[PDB]
Write a protein that binds this ligand. Structure first.
Ligand SMILES: [Ca+2]
Ligand SMILES: [Cu+2]
Ligand SMILES: [Cu+2]
Ligand SMILES: [Cu+2]
Ligand SMILES: [Cu+2]
Ligand SMILES: [Cu+2]
Ligand code: NA
Length: 1034
């Protein structure tokens, strides 16, 4: 279809609380409320000026069309079906240059709506910058791999200005392009959908807007008492919002019961935006998999379905805790329009009645007081583990009073039900609640604590009465469910109807959690968290095991803020011997009580994780917390399959829950750990053990071929950005001046060139000749040599250490002989046996070539940041089969903010490169900035080159990301979409990366021009994690 959309960039004042409330929110008092919505002299408050898209009838732009209540500040909705030509008529009524850049959709270089160096001119910059008053036509065609085969009828896509996109997004220009299949739409609305909504979780940083100057003068009553760097002031401008509606203010979300609702969600913003949206007491599914949470990061695109049940009014919170108490809340209002309900009638309805008590104890994050890994007493002088565990003056140290759930046999909470053999790993986790689809869970809860508590589950049904978090006004009579008094008892009825359990395509049993629901921002962190496990009808033994599985495990990787324990007070009394000197707001104090743990154990001390070779293992993982609970739970040595995909590493977030299926092949003592730099060094690393419980020769199956890459570790001047002309043209085009923290040399600072240790390939085993880097290998940079392998091989890596301290080399997915890597001393040279079984390459639903990282493992963290990272691709042994022409290209992309401050080569870096080596205060955080290098494949600001291809090629992009907590990255390709999974059943143009995420992205280029490739997180675009790839016209 040929479609037209009239959209105008007007300027206006946007109210982030739109009256008149005066609601009852979770973990929010009016002090919180005020921090953000008072209001000068030194505070802008609750209304700001923003530039916003608006819909009109004509290209006269003389009458408008009202944007629905619930849209808030978002531009109007552009629906497009496949092959439609959409003509977006724009008029810039605002006071500055803006644009209209679309996403899941095809456009020439003069319908992009975006401005960078792309080699373009004159006729192709009419898109790139609409000056004030100018009108423009943006021509869109719905002609990518548009929605996937396995994607649903319509998917979430966005549009926004791209002059300085963070600053244009901040300023209010952002809106939804819903993208549907040919031809799902009857009268602009998906056939057989009753309700269509769009939501944005933006932490909308109004400090970054173009309208701060205009906003401080207009709203701050005394504008020279306004240090724009006032830590506090800045944070007073961070509107934790849903369509720009902070604190429960989002209006217009009402739906009749039994309505089919599509929700078109997306993240937007910066490092701070680690969302975790929850639609309270409601049925969710994404791609015919159940989802309880919906995480969203910057520009994370995703749709979901819901049949709206349970008339009433419910919270749509985000359970990132720091987000939650900055009021990232809103309500949706499920009607009782009296539609007839299709009631099965699940036969044979079973009742799982549990007896749990909340009570007190001391933990003992380290029973052993040592590091099973390094061997050391955790408190040794200089150790990274000391900080957390140190005791005396104003440091609590190693043990904390915690409330924790525990199981009792019955009614009278008198006999326990003692922690059995395999339940040894649970630790701080409460007892597992479990059920089948159709059941009726009940939980008799008794409190034996100082404070009042509850049990809020995740992903079961509960009537209003049973809801264990309080909020309103929602019409609740009893507050008893939500508030249980420090020695009271309540019970506690949940149902588990079909829609809350796992689907057709889902695993057997879903990973879930239950927590205490009074004040989430303290009760979970206090120890009030247990695992839950809802399973398919009859998939469970009457004892509660999965019918065909040997061992089940549970893991809760969270960072335990004791800092917000209900009992911080109680602990400062009970364990500091200068309690009067305890400054609760002292950074260095706060650190002491951040127990980076798994099941509340640290530095190797988790018992229970024990299994025999080749057993059916089913791991259930979950997490909770805030934007520093990004995780990569990597099992060394073994891998798992989850919904037909193969990895070894679990990316976890607040209220995320993963079910992993594993059958473990190599025998030994292997490492569960968080790849996230800080969690490792801070003690998030445990052990599991595969034992020989019969055997019994010593190989239990297979291998075939044998390949020999000659690799070497060396040791070189790495410039991160040798030209600057790209950066220079960028900033000249946007008319910005800007100097750069990282790159500019300053007085005392480094800039761009740093000594690093890179992997390289060598020809013989003499290493006198280093392989020359090809021409379509030249895009790799800091990466080591590409390593191909096929489902069957073995890989000899012969590794010389042409470096100056012990390194190693090893790869994810890959298999070896038993649970150990060998170090490789300088000058010395060594061989590694990487086996490549069935469990190292694609799974059912994986596309055939899948990448992994190979990296040093002397010092996981310091080695990795120093330069030692590479790609290993593990392709399925194809065929006798097909012949006649293909064409094909490959690109490995590694997204990493390289912490040069962690380099072994830092000393030498500083001495060598800085103008004055004396002025370098190493803890200076002007400096910890200059040396955080934001880069794709070790290169920045268009100095990652020879991403080059031709129209009609078949490109596989091997994207990976490693590193810290800051290293969440969102990959966006301008011009083109892509697919993932085998064949290409899911399409998107933003792929979400964290440390331990590796994925093959199938792209089919088709448009001549030079196109941009950024991380969509605001800090990283601006830091220089960006480049272009060129597509050429045959
Ligand atoms: Ca352009
Ligand atoms: Cu959030
Ligand atoms: Cu974008
Ligand atoms: Cu990024
Ligand atoms: Cu784009
Ligand atoms: Cu962009
Ligand atoms: Na404010």
């Amino acid at each position: 279809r040929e479609k037209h959309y009239y959209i105008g960039i007007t300027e206006a004042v946007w109210d982030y609380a739109s009256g008149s409330e005066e609601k009852e929110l979770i973990s929010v008092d009016t002090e919180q409320s005020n921090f953000y919505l008072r209001n000068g002299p030194d505070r802008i408050g609750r209304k700001y000026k923003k530039a916003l898209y608006s819909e009109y009838t004509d290209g006269t732009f003389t009458k408008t069309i009202d944007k629905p209540a619930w849209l808030g500040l978002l531009g109007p909705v552009i629906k497009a079906e496949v092959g439609d030509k959409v003509s977006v008529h724009v008029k810039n009524f605002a006071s500055r240059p803006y644009t209209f850049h679309a996403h899941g959709v095809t456009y020439t270089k003069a319908n992009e709506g975006a401005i960078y160096p792309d080699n373009t001119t004159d006729f192709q910059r009419a898109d790139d910058k609409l000056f004030p008053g100018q009108q423009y036509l943006y021509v869109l065609r719905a002609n990518e791999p548009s929605p996937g085969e396995g994607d649903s009828n319509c998917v979430t896509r966005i549009y926004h200005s791209h002059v300085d996109a963070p600053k244009d997004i901040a300023s209010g220009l952002i809106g939804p392009l819903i993208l549907c299949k040919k031809g799902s739409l009857h009268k602009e609305k998906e056939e057989n959908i009753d309700q269509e909504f769009v939501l944005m979780f933006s932490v909308v940083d109004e400090n970054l807007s173009w309208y701060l100057e205009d906003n401080i003068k207009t709203f701050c009553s005394e504008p020279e008492k306004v240090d724009k760097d006032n830590e506090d002031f800045q944070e007073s401008n961070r509107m934790y919002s849903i369509n720009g509606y902070t604190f429960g203010s989002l209006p217009g979300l009402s739906m009749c019961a039994e309505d089919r609702v599509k929700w078109y969600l997306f993240g937007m913003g910066n490092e701070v935006d680690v969302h975790s949206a929850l639609f309270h007491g409601q049925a969710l599914t994404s791609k015919n998999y159940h989802t309880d949470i919906i995480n969203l990061f910057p520009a994370t695109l995703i749709d979901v379905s819901m049949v709206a049940q349970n008339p009433g009014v419910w919270m749509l919170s985000c359970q990132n805790l720091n987000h939650l108490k900055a009021g990232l809340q809103a309500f949706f209002q499920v009607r009782d329009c009296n539609k007839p309900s299709p009631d099965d009638d699940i036969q044979d309805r079973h009742v799982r009645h549990y007896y749990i008590a909340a009570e007190e104890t001391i933990w003992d994050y380290a029973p052993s007081g040592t590091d099973t890994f390094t061997g050391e007493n955790l408190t040794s002088l200089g150790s990274d583990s000391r900080v957390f565990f140190e005791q005396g003056a104003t440091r609590i140290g190693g043990s904390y009073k915690k409330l924790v759930y525990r199981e009792y046999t019955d009614d009278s909470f008198t006999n326990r039900k003692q922690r059995g053999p395999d339940e040894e790993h649970l630790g701080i986790l409460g007892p597992v609640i479990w059920a089948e689809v159709g059941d009726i869970i009940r939980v008799t809860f008794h409190n034996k604590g100082q404070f009042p508590l509850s049990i809020q589950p995740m992903g079961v049904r509960f009537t209003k009465e049973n809801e264990g978090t309080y909020y309103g006004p929602d019409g609740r009579s009893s507050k008893q469910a939500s508030h249980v008094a420090p020695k009271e008892t309540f019970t506690y009825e949940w149902t588990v109807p079909k829609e809350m359990g796992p689907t057709y395509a889902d695993p057997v049993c879903l990973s879930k959690m239950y927590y205490s629901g009074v004040d989430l921002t303290k009760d979970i962190f206090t120890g009030l968290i247990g695992p839950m496990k809802i399973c398919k009808k009859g998939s469970l033994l009457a004892d509660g095991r999965q019918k065909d599985v040997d061992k089940e495990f549970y893991l809760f990787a969270t960072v335990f803020d004791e800092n917000e324990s209900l009992l911080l007070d109680d602990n400062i009394r009970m364990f500091t011997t200068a309690p009067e000197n305890v400054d609760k707001e002292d950074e260095d104090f706060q650190e002491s009580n951040k127990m980076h743990s798994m099941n509340g154990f640290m530095y190797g001390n988790l018992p229970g994780l024990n299994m025999c070779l080749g057993e059916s293992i089913v791991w259930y993982l979950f997490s909770a917390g805030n934007e520093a609970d990004v995780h990569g739970i990597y099992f060394s040595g073994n891998t798992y399959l989850s919904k037909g995909e193969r990895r070894d590493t679990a990316n976890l977030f607040p209220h995320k829950s993963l079910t992993l299926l594993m059958t473990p092949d190599t025998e030994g003592s292997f490492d569960v750990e968080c790849l996230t730099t800080d969690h490792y060094t801070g003690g998030m690393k445990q052990k599991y053990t595969v034992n020989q419980c019969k055997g019994q020769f010593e190989d239990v199956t297979l291998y075939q071929g044998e390949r020999t890459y000659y690799i070497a570790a060396v040791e070189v001047e790495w410039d991160y950005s040798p030209s600057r002309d790209w950066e220079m043209e960028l900033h000249h085009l946007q008319e910005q001046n800007v100097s750069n923290a990282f790159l500019d040399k300053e007085e005392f600072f480094i800039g761009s060139k740093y000594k690093k240790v890179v992997y390289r390939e060598f020809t013989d085993s003499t290493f006198r000749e280093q392989v020359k880097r090809r021409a379509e290998e030249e895009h790799l940079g800091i990466l080591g040599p590409l390593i191909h392998a096929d489902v069957g091989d073995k890989v000899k890596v012969v590794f010389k250490n042409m470096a100056s301290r012990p390194y190693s080399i090893h790869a994810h997915g890959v298999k070896t002989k038993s649970s150990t890597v060998a170090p490789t001393l300088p000058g010395e040279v060594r061989t590694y046996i990487w086996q490549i079984p069935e469990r190292s390459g694609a799974g059912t639903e994986d596309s055939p070539c899948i990448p992994w990282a190979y990296y040093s493992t002397v010092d996981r963290v310091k080695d990795l940041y120093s330069g030692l990272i590479g790609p290993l691709i593990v392709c399925r042994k194809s065929y006798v089969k097909v012949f006649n022409p293909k064409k094909k290209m490959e690109f490995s992309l590694l997204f990493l903010v390289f912490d040069e401050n962690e380099s072994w080569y830092l000393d030498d870096n500083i001495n060598t490169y800085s103008d004055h080596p004396e002025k370098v205060n190493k803890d200076n955080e002007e400096f910890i900035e200059s040396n955080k290098m934001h880069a794709i494949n070790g290169k920045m600001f268009g100095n990652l080159q020879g991403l080059t291809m031709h129209v009609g090629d078949e490109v596989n992009w091997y994207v990976m990301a490693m590193g810290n907590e800051i290293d969440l990255h969102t990959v966006h390709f301008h011009g083109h979409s892509f697919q993932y999974k085998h064949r290409g059943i899911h399409s998107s143009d933003v792929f979400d990366l964290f440390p331990g995420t590796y994925q093959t992205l199938e792209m089919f280029p088709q448009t001549p021009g030079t196109w941009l490739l950024h991380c969509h997180v605001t800090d990283h675009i601006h830091a220089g994690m960006v480049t272009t790839y060129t597509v050429l016209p045959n």
